[PDB]
Amino acid sequence: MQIFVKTLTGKTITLEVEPSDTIENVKAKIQDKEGIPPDQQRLIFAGKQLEDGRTLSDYNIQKESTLHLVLRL
Amino acid sequence: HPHIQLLKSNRELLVTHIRNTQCLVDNLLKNDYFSAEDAEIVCACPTQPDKVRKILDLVQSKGEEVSEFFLYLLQQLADAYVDLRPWLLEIG
Incomplete structure (x- = not known):
């Protein structure tokens, strides 16, 4: 399935994931596409920040969902 | 407005x-x-x-003309590959 991620430089990238994919996996695909260290990424789904442990299924992130990416140093 | 109402x-x-x-x-x-x-705006949802x-x-x-097209878009998108459905689901 596909999820969307708004990197707040305005644009919105489109990813290809599975409900089983962990948050790290999503960060990995983001790193591939945008060149950002996973330990600098924080994924936001509807106001809540996702933990690096759980999966997309555990968050009820279904097809054509949109997450927000913020930086952390 | 039969199309705006049809979508309402x-x-x-x-x-x-x-x-x-x-x-x-x-x-x-x-x-x-x-x-x-x-x-x-839509992607933001x-x-x-x-x-x-x-x-x-x-x-x-945006109006009635835009709505009428949206009906046509959905029609020709659902009818486009519908007869491939049995074979496609048959595989994976």
């Missing part, structure tokens, strides 16, 4: 059964019925049904 009545049916908003936004973008901002709701809101606002 069966609004729940559409939100329920539409499973790809991307190929809808794209086609609307390519026909100048949707601004680049309208696309980003957290869940998929929310995106379906947002698209329907924008369509029913």
Whole structure:
């Protein structure tokens, strides 16, 4: 399935994931596409920040969902 | 306004059964019925049904001509590959 991620430089990238994919996996695909260290990424789904442990299924992130990416140093 | 009303009545049916908003936004973008901002506004919606709701809101606002096209878009997208359905689901 596909999820969307708004990197707040305005644009919105489109990813290809599975409900089983962990948050790290999503960060990995983001790193591939945008060149950002996973330990600098924080994924936001509807106001809540996702933990690096759980999966997309555990968050009820279904097809054509949109997450927000913020930086952390 | 038989088309705006047609989208106002069966609004729940559409939100329920539409499973790809991307190929809808794209086609609307390519026909100048949707601004680049309208696309980003729809993409901003957290869940998929929310995106379906947002698209329907924008369509029913821009007029009747835009609505009539949206009906035609859904028709020729569902009918396009429908007879491949038995074989496709047969595999994976």
